[PDB]
Design a protein around this ligand. Structure first.
Ligand code: K2M
Ligand code: K2M
Ligand code: CL
Ligand code: MG
Ligand code: MG
Ligand code: MG
Ligand code: MG
Lengths: 194, 194
């Protein structure tokens, strides 16, 4: 029933633009919306990837590997799944494994890859693939994991046991000012609810 | 180590603005970021999203989701019920209210997250994730009455909690929708638990 009628640029930065979206409502009435988009999406099936990295080690409980970074939009430190934008021509899987390695040092193995999922659909068109990767923490490659941050990347790695993920996140939030990412909290909540 | 120095307005709509954030990197080099913010916050967070667990005896437990046209996406999305918190409303109250408006269900609060970020590389947007159970056998939830606000057009989709990820993949395959990243993350962790 509903569809887009027009998209008018309001303001275009180097990385983001704001648009006035005109669309048809399902009563047949024309309405508008203020829409955010990135300027960086070409032929990728999504803007970005986030990686769900399951660290596996003999005679260890499984950990979820998370990263902590300053996020200028938030004006503070955030705890997130490792993530980055997909380079032009890069597959989501390759992006995931590459970002995981850059941000954490770990060399993962692909497990699954979601369809494109929306980040904040009442606000932006931004999408990611959520890519689950296992990390064989008993492999020598993953013994001394060294993050390879790009220019202006400053990332800390935080690995938390899957079996206590939500309480461990709460304990970190209780100890300093930081925000947990909504996808991480969602995943931690489901692990409790299961 | 890192912090915001200043914020420069680039452009301001009625609902969203774009800013140029200047921040200090960990080396002591000043850097810029294009940051999106809503114009509507006062509140603990911009919004709530509700994880509604529909409980009927002798039935599978379902998670109640909503499908709506999302003008920033250009299409239909499947999401947790959700909306912005009214000035002077608690996140809990916002959650029960939105849940009722969007689904017609009357629910009970189980737990409430701290403010969690939606897309912290792009925006400052945050929500509280509110877990709510719905006693599907109570008279008041027998014939759930959805009360759309002005311009809301919401379809209710309840899916069994035990098969959530497969059910959502099926909808994406058949219905050509976009699943929300938080919904997808939750569904993933229901499978990954144990
Ligand atoms: N029903 C209303 O009075 N408006 C609310 C939200 N609206 C936007 O444009 C918007 C929100 C986030 C980004 O843009 C238009 C419709
Ligand atoms: N590596 C760089 O030269 N960039 C610095 C500025 N960036 C932004 O401003 C941005 C992206 C999305 C919203 O803002 C991204 C990375
Ligand atoms: Cl529950
Ligand atoms: Mg990143
Ligand atoms: Mg990166
Ligand atoms: Mg809503
Ligand atoms: Mg509503």
């Amino acid at each position: 029933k509903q569809y887009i009628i027009s998209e008018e640029l309001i303001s275009e930065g180097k990385w983001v633009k704001l648009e006035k979206t005109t669309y048809m409502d399902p009563t047949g009435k024309t309405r508008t919306w203020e829409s955010v988009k990135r300027t960086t999406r070409k032929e990728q099936t999504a803007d970005g990837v986030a990686v769900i990295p399951v660290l596996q080690r003999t005679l260890h409980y499984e950990c979820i590997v998370l990263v902590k970074q300053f996020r200028p939009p938030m004006g503070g430190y955030c705890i997130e799944f490792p993530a980055g934008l997909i380079d032009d021509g890069e597959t989501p899987e390759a992006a995931a494994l590459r970002e995981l390695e850059e941000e954490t040092g770990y060399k993962g193995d692909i497990a699954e890859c979601s369809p494109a999922v929306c980040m904040d659909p009442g606000l932006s068109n931004c999408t990611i693939h959520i890519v689950t990767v296992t990390i064989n923490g008993d492999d020598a490659e993953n013994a001394r994991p060294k993050p390879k941050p790009g220019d202006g990347e400053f990332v800390e790695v935080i690995s938390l046991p899957k079996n206590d993920l939500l309480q461990r996140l709460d304990a970190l939030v209780a100890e300093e000012h930081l925000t947990v990412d909504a996808r991480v909290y969602s995943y931690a909540l489901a692990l409790k609810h299961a």
